Amino acid sequence: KEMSDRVLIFAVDASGSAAVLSEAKGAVELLLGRAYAARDHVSLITFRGTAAQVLLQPSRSLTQTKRQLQGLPGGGGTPLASGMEMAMVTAKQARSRGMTPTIALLTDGRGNIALDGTANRELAGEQATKVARAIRASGMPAVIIDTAMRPNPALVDLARTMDAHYIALPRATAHKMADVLGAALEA
Amino acid sequence: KEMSDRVLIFAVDASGSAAVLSEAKGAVELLLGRAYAARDHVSLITFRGTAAQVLLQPSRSLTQTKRQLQGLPGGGGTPLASGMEMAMVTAKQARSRGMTPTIALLTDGRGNIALDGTANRELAGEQATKVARAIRASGMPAVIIDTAMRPNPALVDLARTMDAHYIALPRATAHKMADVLGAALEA
C-alpha cells in the first residue's frame, strides 16, 4: 500500500473505571510528536460509552489536533469488541478520506461481544494493532483477559501487541508504536 | 484569492545528484493526503532533464495523482533551476486551467543562469516556496549553495525557504508545508 502515508484510527477506549485517564491522554500528546502527522489522519474514536469524536478529515492543523486530544472527555464501561470494528473500518475507509488505514485497538480488558467474523473482515483494512490495556486489570490477575487480548491482530501479532498494564506505561510505548508502524512494509 | 482551490505546481527536480529520487516522489504522496483532492492539483513538473510530466487539468482525483507520482521516471543534471520559471509561471497557469497558483521549487543545488528577471516575475504566479535541496552537497559544506537558494521566494523568504540538505528532511518538512499551505492567505 502507500509508503509512509497511514491513518491512525485510535480506538480511544475511555473506560470510566480507569484510574485517572490523564496519563493516557498525555501519551496521545506524545504520539503526534513522533508520528509525522499531516499525512496520517488520527481519528479519535472515543468508545466504551461515547461513540467516536474526531473524524479523518477534520484534523486540518496539528496545533488544533492537539487541542482535541486534550479536550477529549472520558466515560464508558461496556466493551463492544466486534462492535468497534464495524464502527471503525466501515466508516473509516470511505472515499471522503481513503488512504492506508491503521487500526489501533486501545481497548481496556476483555471484550464482551465476540469478534470471530471481524477477524475475516480485518483483511480489508489491515494493521489491527492491539494495545493490551490492563488498567482495570491492575487490581486482579488478568490471565483470561490477556488470552482475550492476544487473538486480535492479524498476521504477526507480537509486533502489534503493545502492553499497557498501568496507564503510566503507554507514554513509553507510544514512541515505539509510531516507529514500528512507520516501517510497516507488508502489503 | 479564493480558498480551497490551489495550483501546487511542484518543480520535481530529478537530478542524479539526488540519491534515490523516491523521497521526492513520496513527499508529494504525503502532501496529497493533506491537500484537498479534486480542487487542488499538484503539477508534476519533472524538469532538469525531462520536460515535465503531469499537468494540472489531467489529474483529478487522488486515485489518479498518487500512481503517477510513483510512476514518474528520473533524469537531470545541469543547474538550470532558474529555467523553471517559464515552464511554471508561463506554461502552467495558462488559460487552459488557471486557478489560484502556488509555485513550489524542489530544485536541487544552484542554478548557473542568473535569476534576476525570473525572481521579479514571481509576482505573476505568487507563493514561490523554495526547497533548499543539496543532496550532492550532503558530503561537503555547501555555503554558497545555501546563499543561492535563500533569495528565491517573494516577500518573507523564511516562511517558504524549507531546507532539504538531505533526503531525510523532505518527508518530515512535508508536514509543516502541508498544514501551512492549507491556510495560505495573503493575496
Curated annotation (Swiss-Prot), chains A, B:
Superkingdom field: Bacteria
Domain VWFA: 7-185
Biological function: Involved in bacteriochlorophyll biosynthesis; introduces a magnesium ion into protoporphyrin IX to yield Mg-protoporphyrin IX.
Family indicated by similarity: Belongs to the Mg-chelatase subunits D/I family.
Name of the protein this chain belongs to: Magnesium-chelatase 60 kDa subunit
Lineage: Bacteria, Pseudomonadati, Pseudomonadota, Alphaproteobacteria, Rhodobacterales
Covered residues, full protein: 373 to 561 of 561
